[PDB]
């Protein structure tokens, strides 16, 4: 008859599929090139994780030109977007914090602040 | 490295933001029009949830054998909200769309009821 059902592992499963598409460049409408290093991603996932990309792809206005401080910092930001996990080291936290601050991703900023305070 | 930061509520947040995009017709490259009603979606989300849409998007370039908009609506609601609402008025319409798109997680859900 009538019933409602919830699949708690569905969000993580879709994100893992979105990650595998990105690692293989499948259905990717966005490609970043930072000094030879390339990064393919989905514009819908970028706008879902970063308010900067939201105002760049959706609102199309009132956005400062893209500025990526470190290529390795951008890879960790995209890795967090598609895996919800972010590896942080005392030799890369500042580079990840630079890209995250420009992209207005307070979740990574809080994660970077957690490592410098809770080493 | 020396530490790994995990965000358990991230994938739920991404799916909710993707749902808000398809509900507002934002950053969507798909448009389902079945019996006069329009449905927006992302081709990357469809391939991530349906093996039929996967093969249709990673290998191929459309008319679908979708019986009714109500069954497609609830199927799209499951993709973007992880929740499936079934009632005796739509369980047959949902299973029809679920079997064509080859999503046995939904197929088994309605096979019981």
């Amino acid at each position: 008859s009538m019933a409602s059902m919830d699949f708690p592992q569905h969000s993580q499963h879709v994100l893992e599929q979105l990650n595998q598409q990105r690692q293989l460049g499948l259905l990717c409408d966005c490609t970043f090139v930072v000094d030879g290093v390339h990064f393919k991603a989905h514009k819908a996932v970028l706008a879902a994780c970063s308010e900067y990309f939201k105002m760049l792809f959706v609102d199309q206005k009132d956005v400062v030109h893209l500025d990526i401080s470190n290529a390795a910092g951008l890879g960790q930001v995209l890795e967090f977007m598609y895996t919800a996990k972010l590896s942080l080291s005392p030799e890369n936290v500042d580079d990840v914090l630079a890209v995250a601050t420009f992209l207005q991703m307070q979740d990574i900023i809080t994660a970077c602040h957690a490592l410098k305070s809770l080493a | 490295s020396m530490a790994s930061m995990d965000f358990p509520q991230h994938s739920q947040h991404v799916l909710e933001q993707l749902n808000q995009q398809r509900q507002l017709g934002l950053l969507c490259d798909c448009t389902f029009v079945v019996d006069g009603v329009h449905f927006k979606a992302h081709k990357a989300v469809l391939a991530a949830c349906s093996e039929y849409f996967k093969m249709l998007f990673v290998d191929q370039k459309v008319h679908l054998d979708i019986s009714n908009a109500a069954g497609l609506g609830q199927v799209l609601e499951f993709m973007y909200t992880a929740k499936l609402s079934l009632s005796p008025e739509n369980v047959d319409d949902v299973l029809a769309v679920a079997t064509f798109l080859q999503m046995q997680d939904i197929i088994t859900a309605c096979h019981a009821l």
Binding site: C30, T31, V33, L66, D67, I68 | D29, T31, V62
Partner: peptide, 21 residues
């Protein structure tokens, strides 16, 4: 009994030099 309109896909490339001053 159904239509699926797919918008054409053009790739958005963003080529940037790193600002590691």
């Amino acid at each position: 009994h159904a239509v699926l309109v797919l918008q054409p896909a053009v790739e958005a490339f963003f080529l940037v030099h790193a600002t590691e001053r």
